[PDB]
């Protein structure tokens, strides 16, 4: 009756529970659209199931913490796509080719000494 | 002027701290100060003995100082004469229960701080620095080391123009973490000035 | 400025001499190093010599210069201009 996946992006972690139904979606105690209200980035989160037509087929209970809304959005995108592969193993094809099943390791590069930021160097006047 | 200290680079990999204990924020400094004063006294007194390492331990109001040395006898004395004398000089300073151990240095010619001090002694005796350095390295390799490198910098032989002389044999892979390399430094005070002596001994890789 | 909850600061050793001169009738010159002391109503009409690091500067206190500090009237830098 329940289906699960773990999404991570940057510093955001999302626990997502897929349970069949009509499509209601909840993030941390609120509707999807309540929590991501005013964010174009949002509907990208529901993209894995749109790939396998599970759009309206599932309700989703979802936790989210750490990072920021966009990273959280990307985290969700991952987990619910793990949940789908879990809900059906043959879902891998038509999910892996969209690279929805992979986690990007791109995170904040550390601040280095001698620099102003990670790579931004201090301005020098040779002469 | 570049190279990283070969010991600090290997702490908790091939090499272990010399003051092993825990202390909280309010206390750390005071223990550390006493720790260094312990080393201060012992570094002067135990020099003639052949001091290589000085390990220090702490629990609560009690501390155990383990002295590594080439000449254990010069530390202990006659049946415990100096060894007893030490605890009193010690726990006077410490002001607490100061356990003093001694332990053998199995091969002083495989102990880098020892090799270093010996050459420093040799060059305060106006010996031929280059001949000395080749010797030191020859000793360390004979004693079985996988490699050795010894360096002397300063007014060598009294010359006005400072120079650096070194010699090496076998392997000394200072870039390799898992390579065990003992390192030691010795200061040679002369009439014309200070010479620095550095000894690298490659015991083997782990 | 200094908290009103706290005092109106005078170095006591400066102040004491003021009241001493007030009683007997003022005034001799008062050499002080107390730049930090407030001019206080009791000081008015006196002339206090304020050390600026080098010289003691004679300052005749008036009704206008009460609220201030003693240092404010013995400038510490010699500047006559540039070029």
């Amino acid at each position: 009756e329940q289906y699960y996946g773990t999404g991570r992006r940057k510093e955001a972690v999302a626990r997502v529970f897929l349970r069949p139904g009509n499509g209601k979606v909840t993030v941390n105690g609120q509707d999807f659209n309540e929590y991501f209200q005013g964010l174009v980035r949002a509907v990208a989160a529901l993209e894995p199931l749109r790939a396998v037509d599970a759009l309206g087929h599932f309700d989703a209970y979802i936790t989210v913490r750490g990072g920021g809304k966009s990273g959280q959005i990307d985290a969700i995108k991952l987990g619910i796509a793990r949940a789908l592969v879990q809900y059906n193993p043959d879902y891998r094809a038509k999910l892996k080719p969209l690279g929805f099943l992979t986690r990007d390791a791109r995170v904040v590069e550390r601040k280095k000494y001698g620099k102003h930021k990670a790579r931004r160097a201090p301005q020098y006047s040779k002469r | 002027g570049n190279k990283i200290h070969p010991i600090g680079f290997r702490l908790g990999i091939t090499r272990d701290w010399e003051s092993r204990w825990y202390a909280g924020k309010k206390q750390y400094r005071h223990l550390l100060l006493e720790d260094q004063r312990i080393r201060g006294l012992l570094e002067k007194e135990l020099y003639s003995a052949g001091l290589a390492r000085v390990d220090i331990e702490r629990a609560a109001d009690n501390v155990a100082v383990t002295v590594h040395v080439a000449k254990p006898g010069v530390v202990i004395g006659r049946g415990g004469e100096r060894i007893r004398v030490l605890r009193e000089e010690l726990a006077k300073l410490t002001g607490k229960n100061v356990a003093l151990n001694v332990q053998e240095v199995q091969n002083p010619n495989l102990s880098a701080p020892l090799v270093a001090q010996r050459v420093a002694e040799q060059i305060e005796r106006r010996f031929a620095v280059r001949r000395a350095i080749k010797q030191a390295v020859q000793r360390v390799m004979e004693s079985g080391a996988k490699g050795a490198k010894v360096i002397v910098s300063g007014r060598i032989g009294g010359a006005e123009q400072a120079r650096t002389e070194w010699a090496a044999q076998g392997r000394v892979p200072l870039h390799t973490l898992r390579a065990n390399i003992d390192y030691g430094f010795a200061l040679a005070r002369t009439t014309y000035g200070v010479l620095g002596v550095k000894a690298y001994i490659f015991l083997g890789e782990v | 400025p200094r908290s009103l909850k706290k005092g109106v600061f005078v170095d006591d050793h400066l102040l004491e001499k003021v009241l001493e001169l007030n009683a007997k009738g003022e005034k001799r010159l008062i050499k002080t190093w107390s730049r930090r002391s407030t001019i206080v109503p009791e000081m008015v009409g006196h002339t206090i010599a304020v050390y600026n690091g080098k010289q003691h500067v004679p300052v005749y206190i008036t009704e206008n210069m009460v609220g201030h500090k003693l240092g404010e009237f013995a400038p510490t830098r010699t500047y006559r201009g540039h070029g």
Binding site: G38, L39, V40, R41, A42, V43, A44 | - | -
Partner: protein, 155 residues
């Protein structure tokens, strides 16, 4: 760079129209990494051009792009003791970049007070063949033809 021909970043298709070209345009609008702002401005503009002229915004946008693409450009090359403006064909990748760049820049030289509006209107003119954006393209091309004589210096 020196070693190899770098890899063109594949963009993620935009949420509303599913278009890599739209995404690219958004980023060009985007100042200070405020993409939400950037997204609104375009989509707001997409709303406006529909009100003013009832068509498909997507159709307008894409038509405006094809109109600002320089097919030929000049690139300098100092041959001998003089810098010749050599006429060159523009790679399709570069045609795109220049088109989207000029579109936004010309947009933001316009006098009306809101960005979405400027972005709207410029896309309307460029679709019809007017506006500073197309002027840029026309000019770049004219320079190229003007120096057709140096087209053998092409590398």
């Amino acid at each position: 760079a020196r070693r190899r021909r770098a890899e063109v970043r594949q963009l993620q298709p935009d949420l509303v129209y599913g278009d890599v070209l739209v995404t690219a345009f958004i980023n060009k609008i985007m100042r200070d990494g405020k993409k939400n702002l950037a997204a609104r401005i375009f989509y707001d503009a997409c709303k406006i051009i529909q009100e003013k002229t009832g068509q498909e915004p997507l159709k307008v946008f894409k038509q405006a792009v094809e109109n600002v693409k320089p097919r030929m450009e000049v690139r300098s090359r100092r041959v001998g003791g003089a810098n010749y403006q050599v006429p060159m064909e523009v790679s399709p990748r570069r045609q795109q970049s220049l088109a989207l760049r000029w579109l936004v820049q010309a947009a933001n030289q316009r006098p009306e007070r809101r960005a979405a509006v400027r972005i709207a209107h410029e896309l309307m003119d460029a679709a019809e063949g007017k506006g500073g954006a197309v002027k840029k393209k026309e000019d770049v091309e004219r320079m190229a033809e003007a120096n057709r004589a140096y087209a053998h210096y092409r590398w």
